[PDB]
Amino acid sequence: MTPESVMMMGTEAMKVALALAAPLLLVALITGLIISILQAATQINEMTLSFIPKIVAVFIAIIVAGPWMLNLLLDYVRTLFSNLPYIIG
Amino acid sequence: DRLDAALRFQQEALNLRAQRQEILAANIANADTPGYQARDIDFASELKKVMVGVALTLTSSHHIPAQAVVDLLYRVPDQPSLDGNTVDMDRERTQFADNSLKYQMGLTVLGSQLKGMMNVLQG
Amino acid sequence: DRLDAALRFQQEALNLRAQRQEILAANIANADTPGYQARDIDFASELKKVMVRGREETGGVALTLTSSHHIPAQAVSSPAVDLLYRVPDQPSLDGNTVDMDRERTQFADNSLKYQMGLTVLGSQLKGMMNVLQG
Amino acid sequence: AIQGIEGVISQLQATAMAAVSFAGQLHAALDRISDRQAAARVQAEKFTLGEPGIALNDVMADMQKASVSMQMGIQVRNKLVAAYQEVMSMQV
Amino acid sequence: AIQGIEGVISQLQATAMAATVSFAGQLHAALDRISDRQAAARVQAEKFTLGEPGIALNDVMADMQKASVSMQMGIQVRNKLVAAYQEVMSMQV
Amino acid sequence: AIQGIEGVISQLQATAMAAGIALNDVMADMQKASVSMQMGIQVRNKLVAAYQEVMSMQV
Amino acid sequence: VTSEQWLYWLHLYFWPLLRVLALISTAPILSERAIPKRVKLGLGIMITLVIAPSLPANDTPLFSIAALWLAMQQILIGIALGFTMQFAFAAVRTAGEFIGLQMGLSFATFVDPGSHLNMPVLARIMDMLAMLLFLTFNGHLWLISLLVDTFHTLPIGSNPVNSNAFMALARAGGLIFLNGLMLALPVITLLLTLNLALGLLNRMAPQLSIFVIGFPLTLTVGIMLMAALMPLIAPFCEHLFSEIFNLLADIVS
Amino acid sequence: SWSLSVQTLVFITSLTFLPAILLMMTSFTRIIIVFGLLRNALGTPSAPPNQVLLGLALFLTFFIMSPVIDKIYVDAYQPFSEQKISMQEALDKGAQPLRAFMLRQTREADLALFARLANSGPLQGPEAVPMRILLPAYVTSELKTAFQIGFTIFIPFLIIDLVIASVLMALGMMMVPPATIALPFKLMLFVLVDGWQLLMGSLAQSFYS
Amino acid sequence: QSWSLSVQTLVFITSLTFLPAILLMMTSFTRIIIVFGLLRNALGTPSAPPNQVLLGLALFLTFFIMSPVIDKIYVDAYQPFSEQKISMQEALDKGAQPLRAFMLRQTREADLALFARLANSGPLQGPEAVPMRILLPAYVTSELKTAFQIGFTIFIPFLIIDLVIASVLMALGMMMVPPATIALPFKLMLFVLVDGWQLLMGSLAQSF
Amino acid sequence: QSWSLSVQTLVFITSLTFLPAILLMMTSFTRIIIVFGLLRNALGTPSAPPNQVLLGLALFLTFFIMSPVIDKIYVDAYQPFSEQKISMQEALDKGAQPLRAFMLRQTREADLALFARLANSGPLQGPEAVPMRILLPAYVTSELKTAFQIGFTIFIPFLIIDLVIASVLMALGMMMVPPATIALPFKLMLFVLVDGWQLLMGSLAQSF
Amino acid sequence: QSWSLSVQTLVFITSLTFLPAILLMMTSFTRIIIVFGLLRNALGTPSAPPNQVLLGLALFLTFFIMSPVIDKIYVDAYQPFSEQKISMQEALDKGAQPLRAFMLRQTREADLALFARLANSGPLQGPEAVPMRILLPAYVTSELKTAFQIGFTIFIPFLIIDLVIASVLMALGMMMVPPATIALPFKLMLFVLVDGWQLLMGSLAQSFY
Amino acid sequence: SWSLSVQTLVFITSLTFLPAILLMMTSFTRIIIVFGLLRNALGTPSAPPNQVLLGLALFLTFFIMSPVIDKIYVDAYQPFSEQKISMQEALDKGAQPLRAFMLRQTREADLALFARLANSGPLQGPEAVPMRILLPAYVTSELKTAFQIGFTIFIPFLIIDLVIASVLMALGMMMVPPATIALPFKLMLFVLVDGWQLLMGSLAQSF
Structure with missing residues (x-):
């Protein structure tokens, strides 16, 4: 009820969002950086060949860590809906 | 029912007026019977008695429900007849006309009450 | 203001009809009282008078009730209309001028004119709800 | 209540x-x-009872007045309900 | 029924x-x-038409009018309930 | 009032x-009040509809 | 007897109802479409039932241009109060949308302005957070109290009016921008530095950077930055509400 | 007591205000606001059709207001129907359990504000609060509680859209709408975590707590 | 014992007011209409088939699905009531049985358990002890959940097409094109080459 | 057997109530309306022709297409009824046949089989005896499928134009130039030059 | 032969409902608003002037365009109606002729031929004998085609500006600069200096002649 | 003076056209278009909500109509009570200030075009322009004025965007999009100079 509880609500929610999005974004960033440094080493420059492995890497990311995200988000939503009638004002 | 309690008094008055009307007409019809006593009822006391029962209990469907199933005062004679008939024409004719008038008044009052209860509902 | 002014003529005419019928009923009630001159009012002149200057009453004063336990009481009250005498038709020994034919003709005429006023006022008020309704 | 009388003395203060x-x-x-309406009904029942002094004229006139008053109340209720329905129909 | 008597003993328990x-x-x-x-008024009229002694015409008419008043009560309550339900269900969330 | 007399002299510059009240007056004022209330409701509804049409715009 | 003067009651209960309902239809949270219309109308009716008997009743007829002027006055007061309150949520929405746009969340607006493709999801997040905070600080009760209080300052009866006062509400349009800049500032600046850092990377071997490495990094950095910045809005939320409230108090009079 | 005609007239007139009682004195407002907000959240403004949600809200309100209705019936309707309590006293007797139910769920701040706006004297205990103060205080408290519940409801459905947009933006697909992708995932979430049982139980507890 | 004919007429004509409510809450109309709306959202165009066509088609589908229940009601309740062999109340009680079975067969256990918890129900026992006022909201909740389960998996192929087209377009280089604009004709092609309408009706019917 | 006059006018008014449903689910209005909406979406102009203009065009096209069926109904069914030659029941039965034939002409056998198998209808010998309750949903489904086919096919030339302009812009290095702004005027030019409106209406009429 | 007063009132009030349909399918309005719907797209601001402003401007322009037709209808048909020298049926027959001529002069022959063939009409001797059922949809079709022609032609100078600005931006190596935002103010410049609105309305009015 | 019921009908009917009066007769279109163009300038098409822009334009319109409202009050509101002039002579008398304002804000070319569109040859004087010719001409003039003001607003933001892109290109960066960098600088320039208050002051001066 108190504004401290509200702002905590937003923080924990958006940290959950950060945890959900961090693996995919970080995998894409690492793949892009690796392809870019390889291009710099080989002196190859086409703006389209960096887009190819990124999709494959990010799609594999759901294969490997997808169940973890799905279990984390469901637990968050379940706990939020269960604690809903105790943060009422 | 509350509807009965509102209309109980006028219904009982109307029924008592009809019964006394029948008694007075019986007195008129038997005017010539030698030895006939003129009978009548005291309207107010009987109206008190009626205004002031246990349906037997029905356990199932086959069980049969309970089956349902006034005091006459002699008129004081005025003139002594030889055949023992105490019916006086004038007295009972006036009483008959009065009872007819009061029956009409009771009908009017009961109809007015029902019509008011109706216009309360109409809409 | 505008709506009050537009509906004021028929409303005042209907009130004057009511008062005239009260007077006529008083004449009919006193029809057998010895020494009672029949009273009546000039409808048109009194209607214009009430039109120009608002309705007024002879007295109509009353005890003031500041508290909630004061006993309410009002003294006699009557309109500011001029009660004129009707010209008798034929003489009578008791001394009243209430001729029953005149009384019952004026009663029926006032009845129909009051119903006419009700009809006109109701028509105007519907003629207005028709506009407002939407 | 004891606390109710406390509240009464508080409102007096x-x-x-x-x-x-x-x-x-x-x-x-x-x-x-x-x-x-109850007065008219009671007078009518008293007349039907046979008690002296109650005239049929007064009974009938009082029943007439009671009917007129009931009709006035019915009309006031009808309008009042119509006005409430009109107000509740307003779009905010 | 056997199961009906089982239910009777269950209600006794x-x-x-x-x-509620x-x-x-x-x-x-x-x-x-x-x-x-309505059925009581109708049966009273039945017996009075059949000629059975003990039934009075004024009672017949009064009972019929009472039944009419009761049915008007029911009709008005029905109208109010249906109007309220329709206005509640015509609302948008 | 003293201020009321001030207002009177201002209007001069x-x-x-x-x-008791009869059915004739009671019913007439009752109807007049119903009419005025309906007029107020309709005018406010028009104003509110115009305002919501203005605010439902797209700039 | 049996008078029940209807015009007196109507004139006593109408104009306060007009002002209360005008505030209701525009005041934040009380004007959200999710509330059924009948609930709003009943709240206005009950508030007027509580308030009106204490006020001096007006006698101007409903069938006059004076009634129209009165109705216009009540509508103006109500919408002014509600809108001045709404300005704070407008400012919060602006700050959130700008943080989100510096996230690169909706890049299609820079190339197709207003092309039916825009999602200010951060703006919505902080808008609903601001609504929750406003509910917590009981701002709506205050709004209702001030709606009542503006009578003593400005009675129902037609009163003369001023001018630059309207400008003030219009000039409040500056606050939406001015306060929005500060909220952002605590994050956009660092994001700016991040973009500057990306520029240093592009000053190396040409191409092979930006649109491939900049977007995910800046998205994650914006996310965690403003996730850490979330505790900061509440003091700024109270500051915004106080600014709107005392501006309203000063200018309505 | 009143004449039977007057009692029938009052009963028929009072039958009119049933929607007002349901909306302003009952648990209906919070449930309907929460349902509308949730429907706004999932991105399907016409999904459970208004009639389905209205019927569910009516059944929920009937299940929630059961003890209050029972107390009214046992204390007011039963003596009135048995000609023990007059018509003008059954209303007063039955208005007390509803008043108590409205009080418990209301809030001090609203009560203080509406006690000040009426220029009423000090209210040392809750037993001195009239209905003219409790009604709008209860209404405002219910509105605020419903909006709080809905606004904490809204957060996950916007979180999903945020992460969807960020993931789409990582790969450079800047011209893909995020709402169209997020809607199936929001439906999947609301299916997985017992979307309705948890919400139903949370609302019911929110009343009984 | 039987009701008077006036009472029967009053009840019969009053009950017709709940016909839309019965059709929506108690029958299969809700699930079909929700699935159709979700499919319209999934097609990429929000109002391609007018609401009227979808509503009529959903009504016909609901009638065809519920025809066995209607036949059972007619055999059990309507026919023996119209021949003046049973009373109105007993006819309604008898006719509530097949509809209760239909509602139970598609009811989630958790929904029924929760709504029995909220109604203070204690020793329930046989599946034939659930009252109508408890069974109905549980059925509505289960129908909403099932409709959402169907919709979110109806969404899948169109998301696949959208993602494939966007990925191909951006990887090829044309990143300034709107992928949805090019994708919509392909969504229509997929829907017409699979016989999406016929298969969707088959799946909706076989869901019961 | 002939209905009394009051029953006849009750039936007539109740049937007049169902007019939009008949127009949408029994005539060619739905297919034309769907194709028009898809075409409007295809030009990149979501609100250029107002909905009322397209609705009026679809209504007139439907009237022209259904003129032979209406003429058959008038000559075979309505005219004898208006001259009191035949009753209302047999007039309606005779008027059903031409409309039924028209709807059967434009339905797909697979959808008819689906709705027959779903409704548990017994084997039906030939097209002569197929209930309207079976034919109407099948016809609606077939109309939906045909409309989607036509719209998807129509979507092709504008897709060609968009792709060619996007490629021309991209091969010039213009990386941040959106192709919609350049494509919309050329889409309008293409639709104007081929006499698009009359050609598309003629194609829709010829398909019926 | 004249209709009764009740039937005349019924027909008049019934025909009053077709006012938007008549305005769209029989007057100039369809060509105007559609062009506006495209012009706001050419300027790069879909918001543009608000929708209601454009609609009312189109309405005023339509009234000015149909002033001669309205005057001819008022003189030939409605004036005898008011002065009692004609019936309602004859007035309806006579007043439509100037409007039919106005519709025919802007009707392409190909569309008219298409709708004849589609109605299986017999050999029409001359324009004067063309049925309204054939003239209405053909007029609407030709109207749409003409509006699209005008809109595409309007789309030209803004395309010129966009192409020039994009070429200038790319020739300087400023490849990452979106040219839409830069070219929008120059489109506004072009519409202001040339007096785009007045010129466009004059062109539309002259086009109808 | 005609019937009261007809007066009520006419009044409620004229109440419907209130958005038309606000848009076509007052200046509301000008402020709303200026706000839309300014929002398009900063690069954020949803930063202030459409509701807030509409309300700000409404308040600006109310102030800038306050002199005309005062003239209406003097010429129409007051004498309608003293009944020196009423009904006809007054509604037109009260509308006269609107005519003066719209003549002031209307260009001659639009009026000339709309006159030759109505074959009104003998329109010689400039205070007897009919409403049918005055209204659409005034709307077109308002559109032109709003577009000019929008371009003037556009100039500094376009300059800032161009400068940011030029410095990015000169510094060696060829891939960094200049919009992301230039957006916060656009905002800090807009706030620091206090763009909003000067914009409203100029709009009020723009009449």
């Missing part, structure tokens, strides 16, 4: 320091109409 | 242990009240 | 520069 409504009016009108 | 409003039940009770009033 |  409030009055000391300091030194009806539409629903009330409607309740008063309903009570007046019901009282008139 | 319920009474032993013991030693219903709007549908209330509506059923009110409809019953109206229907038995 | 303005002129200088310029140079």
